[PDB]
Amino acid sequence: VSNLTVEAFEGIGSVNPMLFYQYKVTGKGKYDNVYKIIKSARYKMHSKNRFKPVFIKDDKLYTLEKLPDIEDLDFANINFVKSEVLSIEDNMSIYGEVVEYYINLKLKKVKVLGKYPKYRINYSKEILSNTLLTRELKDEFKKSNKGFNLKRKFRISPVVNKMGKVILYLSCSADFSTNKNIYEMLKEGLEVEGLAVKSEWSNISGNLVIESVLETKISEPTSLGQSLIDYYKNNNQGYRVKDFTDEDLNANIVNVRGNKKIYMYIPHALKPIITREYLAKNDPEFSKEIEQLIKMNMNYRYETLKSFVNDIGVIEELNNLSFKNKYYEDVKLLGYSSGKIDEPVLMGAKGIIKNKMQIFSNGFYKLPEGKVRFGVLYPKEFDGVSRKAIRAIYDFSKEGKYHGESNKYIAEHLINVEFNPKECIFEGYELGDITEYKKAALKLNNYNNVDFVIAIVPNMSDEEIENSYNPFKKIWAELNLPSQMISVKTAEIFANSRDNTALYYLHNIVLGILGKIGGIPWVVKDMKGDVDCFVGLDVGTREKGIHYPACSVVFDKYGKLINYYKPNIPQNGEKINTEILQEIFDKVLISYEEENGAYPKNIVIHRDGFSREDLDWYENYFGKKNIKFNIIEVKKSTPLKIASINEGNITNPEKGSYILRGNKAYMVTTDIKENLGSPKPLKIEKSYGDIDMLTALSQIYALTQIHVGATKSLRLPITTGYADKICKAIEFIPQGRVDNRLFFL
DNA sequence: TGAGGTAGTAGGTTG
């Protein structure tokens, strides 16, 4: 009965064709090939009007209400040339943006009381609500005494239908904004360079990372041929310059990058972005207040968007268009298909397991071998604490958790290690300069038989402790010494241990120390399809082209072993060409040859958000390598979210259920109860391959289940998740480019 | 950093 529905809405009416004052871009100056010029000229025309909507074709610029003037800026000349009512089916995104603009106009006049209104409107894709609906539906706007307003960011996405119907894909998010501005913080004498900055005079052209405060005066002429206020006064945006004084224009223009070119903004227009973590740092109790409000389950999001579409109401400008007040009872009416895939059984050493708990009763599937002997590096003021902790770790690693060496859930000799406190070494470090931690790690290196240090770091809770996790990782990753550090907090847990949370921590940390060496605890008994090998692909963005940093080729259909290969790129400036990918898959093939001796017949490849530009290379190469294969894209961050729908109630979806359109699939992987928010599902589509998507989803969900670094499962698959975690710890690769051991846990 | 969730990120680019 568990039916599923994405966060979207049905339009009641049907839109009509309407007359469009179409404009043609004509090139001006040395900016020929105007296809790049249109994207700026839209916002330019949208700025010369008071955000009247300007639309995009390859040379045609459609507008509901005419800007009768020609334009004078040097990029293009734009003319009136005669209007025409457009078609419906040819203009899908066009009428979608029509629905966007009229939802903007309708919600511009919405308030809760006689004050600043309910929503803040940029006539754009995103909608900010000035107030915020709570679980008691009271719409109380949230505000700290130090600023830092909490607002809902609504990303609407209407799509029209060729029969005139419209579907409103609707998404709700949280936004953190202060009242303090960049001009105000520059009056504060605070250096703001490198801060991620959004602008509020402008629109969606964001992620505008700031560059440098200049000597440059606003009132004096700049590179743009005018004063920076004259940028707005000569346009119709002079209304934003009707609160300035002589003092308000002394200390002035900052530079800011917009992914293509530096800009010059008024600092008044610029505002800092605020993360969850920036607010939690600066104002922790306000974050404690809004902690209930940031995490949103499907009931809360659904009530939010109920109130939102009730605020929308009807649009009498359009053909009496209104939306429904609830989600769909089916995605098949939307154009998807649903279901819940099983999770296949897993297996370790002894055989098929029932859960990820009893793997320690049933032994680890893969062990690196060589009887690693761990050494320990501890803070000197926690000596007996460290002794009890490592004693617990080693005794659970061989016999059991308590003094009562439990075999109710634990088998003997789960990892071949030897630790005599008399023989094997454990040495202390005192807190201080980073040079001391380096001397301690190097002193550890001076001994022999110290393979796989297990150290103890102070807490990240106490900020005034300068805990040496990162220097220990750097020095021990310079060597081939895998590491596993623990907090002094969990060290006190191991010391003051009477309940049975200690076994949970020990399950967790033993999976960690197994993963740091080349050992695999449990793998899949049976996949569905006939794939032989798994290859993971991430993004690097070293250049905005075909950029690719690192691969993690999971060996078998079992997943029974895992290789990762970091192609140490020839010096940066060398081409990012698929010759790199040739090296990658040759390494993959020889790796599968060392593991099996036979060529893998079928390989699925999981790529990240770097686009579908080079499928033909994989085609030609694997055709010459005579091997059928699959390529399935995994996008880790999607705005779209899936809600399990009962009779009328809206719960979070149970894990392992999917939403499927032909070669575009959504599914949920994690299990999140209602107290912790929403599950962020996966965006999954097959670029090229042969298998049905159900087999791919079953394989990739069992591939989210098996994992080497933790007890409970993950959101990401093993492939792109492990590749991305390698892509995080770039300075932490032991530079040999290929290891069976996984440092990055 | 016991581990994992969440939340945060814009759609092929816009002084």
A715 nearest nucleotide via C1' and CA? B5
A718 contact partners, CB below 8 Å, separation of at least 6 = A534, A536, A552, A554, A559, A562, A703, A704, A706, A707
Q: Are residues A593 and A701 in the same domain?
A: yes
Tell me which residue of A668, A540, A656 sits closest to A609, measured CA to CA: A540
Spatial distance from the CA of A53 to the C1' of B14 (Å): 14
Q: Residue A110 domain-assigned?
A: yes
User: Could you tell me if residue A649 is inside a domain?
Assistant: no
Residues A112, A139 within the same domain: yes
Residue A238 is given by DSSP the state G
Note whether residue A671 is domain-resident: no
Could you identify the residue written with the tokens 């989803």?
Answer: A697
CA of A75 to C1' of B2 (A): 58
- CA A648, A651, A655, A659 torsion-angle sign: positive
What is the residue whose two structure tokens read 């006939």?
A530
Bases of chain B within 7 A of a CB of the protein:
1-15
Domain with A233, as residue range(s), is 96-322
In terms of DSSP bridges, do strands A321-322 and A314-315 run parallel, antiparallel, or are they unpaired?
A: antiparallel
Residue A447 lies in a domain: yes
* Distance of alpha carbon A428 from alpha carbon A387, whole angstroms: 11
- The reply to whether A377 and A484 lie within a common domain is yes
Q: What residue has its CA nearest to the C1' of B15?
A: A263
Beta strands in A483-573 (DSSP E): 486-487, 523-524, 533-537, 551-554, 564-565
Task: Looking at the structure, tell me whether residues A482 and A535 fall in a common domain.
Answer: no
Structure tokens at A512: 């960690």
Residues A502, A442 share a domain? yes
CA–C1' A637–B9 (A): 7
Question: Please, what is the Cα angle at A280 between A278 and A283, to 5 degrees?
Answer: 100
Q: Are A433 and A488 in the same domain?
A: yes
Q: Identify whether the C-beta of residue A483 lies closer than 8 Å to the C-beta of residue A743.
A: yes
Q: If we measure between CA atoms, which residue out of A272, A275, A269 comes closest to residue A210?
A: A272
Token pair for A417: 């290690």
Asked whether residue A266 is domain-assigned, the answer is yes
- The Cα A583–Cα A460 span in angstroms is 40
Ramachandran quadrant class, A231 (left: phi over 0; alpha: psi -120 to 50; beta: rest): alpha
Give the integer Cα–Cα distance in Å for A175 and A151: 5
Q: How far apart are CA A743 and CA A518, in angstroms?
A: 9
Residues A310 and A405 in one domain: no
Q: Which nucleotide is nearest to A265 (CA to C1')?
A: B15
CA distance A710 to A708: 6
Residue with nearest Cα to nucleotide B14 C1'? A40
- Give Cα separations from A256 to A74, A193, A270, A543, A691 (angstroms): 22, 9, 10, 20, 47
Residues A584 and A706 in one domain: yes
Strands (E), A323-367: 337-340, 346-347
CATH of the domain at A460: 3.40.50.2300
A468 and A509 assigned to the same domain: yes
Determine, yes or no, domain membership for A15.
no
Q: Is residue A672 part of a domain?
A: no
Same domain, A473 and A451: yes
> Of A289, A322, A355, which closes a domain?
A322
C-alpha span between A268 and A598 (Å, rounded): 65
| Domains identified in chain A, total number | 4
